[PDB]
Design a protein around this ligand. Structure first.
Ligand SMILES: CC(C)CN(C[C@@H](O)[C@H](Cc1ccccc1)NC(=O)O[C@H]1CO[C@H]2OCC[C@H]21)S(=O)(=O)c1ccc(N)cc1
Ligand SMILES: CC(C)CN(C[C@@H](O)[C@H](Cc1ccccc1)NC(=O)O[C@H]1CO[C@H]2OCC[C@H]21)S(=O)(=O)c1ccc(N)cc1
Ligand SMILES: [Cl-]
Ligand SMILES: [Cl-]
Lengths: 99, 99
């Protein structure tokens, strides 16, 4: 699609066999999702935004469907107030900003 | 332009006589920058992100050039780690997210 920005750019995602929704966020370097179970080994990380830092679990090579488009990459899990799709996955679906 | 997301989508911004850069951020409702030169009195506001909530300085009716395009609207000054152009101004310059 072509998504205008009068409201938050939220899309349906599928991760871990579950349908969720997430914000398409060109300001986020990495994808961060609310607490859930994912396969494989994780590594502890910190991410910082407005507000300060949070503790997250880093899982690698996770399959996610974004608005019907498959992407595979790193997913961070932790206490974000909203699920966020960052640039590491937006690049895999060929998302662009246009003006 | 049609901007890919392999690196941060930074663009030139001009406010008054000051040339700066800022992140085009579809995940930000509001535009927030770290400093503006001699901008006068502000109105207090709070905003929240990953991390928690911060006090910012709200300024209305600011004329800002964003990647060559003129916008007029609200700019927040506060402790943001990177200057961000949020949706309140992205809509004025006709930006859309595409995939
Ligand atoms: C501040 C940015 C450079 C970075 N952030 C992405 C950003 O889009 C967040 C994404 C976001 C969105 C909602 C809640 C928390 C975080 N937006 C945000 O803080 O916006 C603030 C200004 O406008 C307001 O509207 C939303 C909150 C306020 S972030 O969420 O801190 C972040 C940082 C690192 C990663 N990997 C993922 C996310
Ligand atoms: C996304 C979180 C689950 C990540 N964890 C953060 C941790 O502080 C959580 C933060 C936390 C807090 C509440 C709910 C989930 C996670 N605490 C926690 O798991 O506490 C456990 C012991 O008490 C039990 O009750 C709460 C969960 C259990 S962590 O994996 O230990 C970890 C630690 C350090 C870093 N940098 C990154 C990750
Ligand atoms: Cl530019
Ligand atoms: Cl002043």
């Amino acid at each position: 699609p072509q998504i205008t920005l009068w409201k938050r750019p939220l899309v349906t995602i599928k991760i871990g066999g579950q349908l969720k929704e997430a914000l398409l966020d060109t300001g986020a370097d990495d994808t961060v999702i609310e607490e859930m179970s994912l396969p494989g080994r994780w590594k502890p990380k910190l991410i910082g935004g407005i507000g300060g830092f949070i503790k997250v679990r880093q899982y690698d090579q996770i399959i996610i469907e974004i608005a019907g488009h498959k992407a595979i990459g790193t997913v961070l899990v932790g206490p974000t107030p909203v699920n966020i799709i960052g640039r590491n996955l937006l690049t895999q679906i060929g998302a662009t900003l246009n003006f």
